[PDB]
């Protein structure tokens, strides 16, 4: 009977968007982090959201996570986004196809190709 | 049974309404090709093949999408050149376009031709 | 309104289908309309199979199996939950 509502979870994700390197695993530390970085109207809601963000830490710190977006992780995912092999891994020097895949080329007039071989 | 000049026109309407480029017709007729001559004269279909190898025949017309409806009035009427005037209003969309094709002793011809030659006959059909 | 395409029975190209008897109420319903399941049950359920392999005199003996093709009418099938009332859309599929 302890499921957190949207006023909790939306706020937890939104605050964890912005303040990552400035908040940590420890519940009480996150409490006092949130004191200076947000204004709420109840200490129990403060505790509630801090206690949701702390296991948001304990999930983020080990694996990726849904929508919430952080520069310190998106930039690295972009750095490993944009790499290539030293040369294109798929090589055209050898292509092994069958009679009708050759009929392709023969109908296109191309009985002779580099790197196309009979199975 | 078969009572063609309907089997041709309904095929043509179906082909046009589906947007097909050419429609072919399994029986032919001197009357059928004389009807298509009226269409082609009045510029509703373009040229066409008449496959006459040996049998009843076969035809292939190419549709230009310029036709909109074409029909046969089987139960072919009697029709005076004094009283087409209330078939043209009864069937054709308006008094400017559309043609009613009536067979007359001068062969197959549309109703505007029938006004000027002043000869009546039997309704073969219409197109507009 | 027509509840089903085929009427609840698969009868095409025929005029008469030989009837059969419900296995529960013995109602005469056509063979192409009766809910027909080929139940193949164990002679005993798996909590009493070790105990019979500990009593078969000749080793390597496998338990026979009850093969029987039970028929039900629609009334008894519904009542015994052989089949269930499905939604207007889910009704159609045959899987």
């Amino acid at each position: 009977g302890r499921v957190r509502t949207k006023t909790v979870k939306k706020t937890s994700r939104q605050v964890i968007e912005k303040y990552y390197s400035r908040m940590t695993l420890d519940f009480h530390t996150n409490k006092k982090v949130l004191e200076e970085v947000s204004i709420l109207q109840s200490k129990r809601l403060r505790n509630k959201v801090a206690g949701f963000t702390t296991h948001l830490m304990r999930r983020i710190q080990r694996g990726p996570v849904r929508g919430i977006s952080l520069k310190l992780q998106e930039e690295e995912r972009e750095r490993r986004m944009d790499f290539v092999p030293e040369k294109s891994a798929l090589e055209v020097d050898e292509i092994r196809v069958d009679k009708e895949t050759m009929d392709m080329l023969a109908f296109l007039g191309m009985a002779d190709l580099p790197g196309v071989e009979r199975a | 049974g078969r009572r063609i000049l309907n089997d041709a026109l309904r095929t043509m309407v179906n082909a046009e309404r589906r947007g097909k480029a050419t429609a072919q017709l399994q029986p032919i007729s001197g009357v059928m090709i004389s009807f298509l001559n009226i269409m082609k004269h009045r510029g509703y279909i373009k040229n066409f093949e008449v496959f006459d190898p040996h049998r009843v025949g076969k035809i292939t017309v190419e549709l230009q999408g310029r036709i909109k409806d074409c029909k046969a009035l089987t139960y072919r009427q009697d029709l005076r050149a004094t009283e087409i005037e209330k078939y043209r209003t009864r069937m054709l969309p308006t008094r400017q376009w559309g043609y009613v094709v009536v067979t007359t002793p001068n062969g197959v011809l549309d109703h505007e031709e029938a006004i000027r030659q002043n000869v009546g006959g039997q309704v073969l059909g219409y197109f507009h | 309104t027509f509840k089903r395409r085929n009427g609840g029975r698969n009868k095409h190209g025929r005029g008469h289908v030989k009837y059969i008897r419900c296995s529960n109420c013995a109602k005469c319903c056509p063979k192409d309309k009766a809910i027909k399941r080929f139940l193949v049950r164990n002679i005993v359920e798996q909590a009493a199979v070790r105990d019979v392999q500990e009593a078969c005199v000749h080793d390597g003996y496998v338990l026979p199996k009850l093969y029987a093709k039970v028929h039900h009418c629609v009334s008894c099938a519904i009542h015994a939950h052989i089949v269930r009332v499905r939604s207007r859309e889910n009704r159609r599929n045959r899987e």
Partner: protein
């Protein structure tokens, strides 16, 4: 061109699927004309062996009966 798989009477100008074939046997080195869909057993005038067996479609040839379309 599909006009050979297409039906016999639905082609543009309908044409038969059959043909006359000159059959020449092994036992009688003469030539006899037979129809593709024979419908009747036919025997070589000399050797009297059967050339074909009627069937619902093309007639069945006997072993060692070489035939040329014509």
């Amino acid at each position: 061109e599909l006009e050979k798989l297409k039906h016999k009477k639905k082609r543009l100008v309908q044409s038969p699927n059959s043909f006359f074939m000159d059959v020449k046997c092994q036992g009688c080195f003469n030539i006899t004309t037979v129809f593709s869909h024979s419908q009747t057993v036919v025997v070589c005038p000399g050797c009297q062996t059967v050339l074909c067996q009627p069937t619902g479609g093309k007639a069945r040839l006997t072993e060692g009966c070489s035939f040329r379309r014509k």
